[PDB]
Design a binder for these strands. Structure first.
Ligand code: ZN
Lengths: 189, 136, 216, 52
RNA sequence: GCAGUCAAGCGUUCAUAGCGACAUUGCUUUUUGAUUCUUCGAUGUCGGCUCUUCCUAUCAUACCGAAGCAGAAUUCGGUAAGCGUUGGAUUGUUCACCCACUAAUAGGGAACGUGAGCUGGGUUUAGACCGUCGUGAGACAGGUUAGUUUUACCCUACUGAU
């Protein structure tokens, strides 16, 4: 039933600093600074070393032990986007009507717009999330490479363009037009 | 509703409801046009649907040329006698209710139209405008 | 009119079969209570599985027929007719009656109400108690993965919870497997038509030498 | 133009899916139970019929 | 009437896009029963008009999923009762049935909503005719005509007013 002890270990890379007090994880490193708040989990961190953090739990059930290894992976995605970073290559697919994507800075921030998506006359606004720079691949005419130091604000922004460029009232297996993600790489690789 | 109408017409005072009878204007042998319903015609309980100047009504012939009697045909009304307001201010009304037989697509079955034809009708259907002697 | 099966599910009234006092009874919807390799010896099929019941209620005649069909259009398609001995164990012997009052039912404009409520027979039923084999299937041991599935498909055609139990007896007999090994080692047991005849140590002596030539 | 690798990419989100038989909900291709509480996480699934 | 269950077979291929035979478990109370608990010092018994509100088992509209969904067109399914769901010929009709419009002409409750609100066409007194039945008086959930619709000023409710 309730497992008496369940531990995981977060290997902390070189040059990377981690600051934890009352389940708030501030990570600084060679590029970027990430602060994720974890008050919703009963989890005890402990500094067993300067190179690796032990994360443990006590008397947890199957529900709670399952929500322990999701904590190690969330810190591991924090330090990985802080050492290397994250970049998402996205790709334009269209049958006839070309998609024309730009970047505009309106009153608030860098809205992303698409125009002529399947011949449509309505622009499709989608804001950037901050910490994410927006990049176009110059060599390939139909490509877009999102990038940033958090995997969350990139991938939510990468799924934002997938959600906004959908089809309506047609066969999706015939009308396979849209802006899909193909590659989820790191920045320094 | 009015399939084949070119653009939009405004609100003209509904002067001739169902059961009305218009003297047919064209020379296609009909004389009366007993309105049985109108294209348009929103639904409210015990309200019988009414037609105005320029609507397409569905009408049966009650007098003349037995080729056309005893069946249903669409008709375009070209004169009404209920005084309606033009948006430039003036109120006006013709001296008889009158209607012109047509198909659904607006092709008037006749060849010409006697009497005057209201501007609100002649502007809406092109083939009642290419057959009208006097546009008011 | 086919009145639903939840109307004649429980055992409310006492048994009432066809008799000399029940001359006008229609027949059942079952006519063949045994299909498969009916002309098979006891020796070829050493495994028997039982489809027993968990409650005390009545089994309809067309219900058992439709489940007899469903078990038999499974094992004949995935294992063929040769490799099962299906034997429907329970017989529809009860008679279910119905109180008809239809708008032209034997009588005048209005038939009656609950006056003279005795009803003419319309259907048969098969009474099954708590633990009573319904579908005994005899086949080989290594072909048992079909009859677990095949009688699982028969379970959905009649109400109640019905267990699928395998039996340690040598097929359709009433004695275990290790007894039948020693009774096949020694020649004590002699093959009948689709059953088998056992040794009677009690009896006339010469009839136990007129029979059993292999023993002694 | 086609770029037939991109049609393999576009099928990952539209054609390489599975549908539940009870609630008709679109599901992963490697599903085992439906992710809803209306069918009841049923284990009666089906693949998505493709084109032609 | 409304659904669930298992799947032989239909769908030229293909048990389930859609159906589904043989069987089986249910729900609903808008049908019809069956019963006789309440009402015989009377609860005004059909239908229509008027009017409000509620239900979801969704006809339309909104946003979605699914297919023998290329588009159009059409079918199936989910959240959803917010909002709409008509004009007429015939019949006393509920019901039916056509004509026509419409986005659509969905199904039901509320003492089979609603008569000190109406109407009285129907049925259900007395007049009278016909048909059959009866020797006869008379009979007929058979046909056809003519047949008085009473009271609120009290309490509550509601609408306004001090
Ligand atoms: Zn599902």
């Amino acid at each position: 039933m309730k497992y008496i002890q369940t531990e995981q270990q977060i290997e902390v890379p070189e040059g990377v600093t981690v600051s934890i007090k009352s389940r708030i994880v501030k990570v600084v490193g060679p590029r970027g600074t990430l602060t994720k708040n974890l008050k919703h989990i009963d989890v005890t961190f402990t500094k067993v070393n300067n190179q690796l953090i032990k994360v443990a739990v006590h008397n947890g059930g199957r529900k709670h032990v399952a929500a322990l290894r999701t904590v190690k992976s969330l810190v591991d995605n924090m330090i990985t986007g802080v050492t290397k970073g994250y970049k998402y290559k996205m790709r334009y697919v269209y049958a006839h009507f070309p998609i024309n994507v730009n970047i505009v800075e309106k009153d608030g921030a860098k809205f992303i717009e698409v125009r002529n998506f399947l011949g449509d006359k309505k622009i499709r606004n989608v804001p950037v999330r901050d910490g994410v720079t927006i990049e176009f691949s110059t060599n390939v005419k139909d490509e877009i490479v999102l990038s940033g130091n958090s995997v969350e604000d990139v991938s939510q922004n990468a799924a934002d363009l997938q959600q906004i460029c959908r089809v309506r009232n047609k066969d999706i297996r015939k009308f396979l037009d849209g802006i899909y993600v193909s590659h989820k790489g790191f920045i320094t690789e | 509703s009015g399939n084949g109408a070119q653009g939009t017409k405004f609100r003209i005072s509904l002067g001739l409801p169902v059961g009305a009878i218009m003297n047919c204007a064209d020379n296609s042998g009909a004389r009366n046009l007993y309105i049985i319903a109108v294209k348009g015609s929103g639904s409210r309980l015990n309200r019988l649907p009414a037609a105005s100047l320029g609507d397409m009504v569905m009408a049966t012939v009650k007098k003349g040329k037995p080729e056309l009697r005893k069946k249903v045909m669409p008709a375009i009304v070209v004169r009404q006698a209920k005084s309606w307001r033009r948006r430039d201010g003036v109120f006006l009304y013709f001296e008889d209710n009158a209607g012109v037989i047509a198909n659904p697509k607006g092709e008037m079955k006749g060849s010409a139209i006697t009497g005057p034809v209201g501007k609100e009708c002649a502007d809406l259907w092109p083939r009642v405008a290419s057959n009208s002697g006097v546009v008011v | 009119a086919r009145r639903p099966a939840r109307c004649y599910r429980y055992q409310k009234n006492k048994p009432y079969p066809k008799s000399r006092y029940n001359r006008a009874v229609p027949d059942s919807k079952i006519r063949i209570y045994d299909l498969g390799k009916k002309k098979a010896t006891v020796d070829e099929f050493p495994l028997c599985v039982h489809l027993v019941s968990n409650e005390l209620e009545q089994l309809s005649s067309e219900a058992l027929e439709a489940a007899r069909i469903c078990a038999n259009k499974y094992m004949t398609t995935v294992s063929g007719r040769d490799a099962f001995h299906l034997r429907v164990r329970v017989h529809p012997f009860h008679v279910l009656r119905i109180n008809k009052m239809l708008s032209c039912a034997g009588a005048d404009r209005l038939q009656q109400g609950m006056r003279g409520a005795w009803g003419k027979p319309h259907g048969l039923a098969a009474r099954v108690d708590i633990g009573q084999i319904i579908f005994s299937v005899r086949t080989k041991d290594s072909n048992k993965d079909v009859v677990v599935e095949g009688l699982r498909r028969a379970r959905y055609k009649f109400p109640g919870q019905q267990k699928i139990i395998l039996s340690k007896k040598w097929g359709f007999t009433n004695l275990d497997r290790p007894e039948y090994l020693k009774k096949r080692e020694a020649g004590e047991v002699k093959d009948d038509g689709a059953f088998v005849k056992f040794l009677s140590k009690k009896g006339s002596l010469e009839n136990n030498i007129r029979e059993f030539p292999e023993y002694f | 133009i086609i770029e037939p690798s991109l049609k393999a990419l576009a099928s990952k989100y539209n054609c390489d899916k599975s549908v539940c038989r009870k609630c008709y909900a679109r599901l992963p291709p490697r599903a085992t139970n439906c992710r809803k509480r209306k069918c009841g996480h049923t284990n009666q699934l089906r693949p998505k019929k493709k084109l032609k």
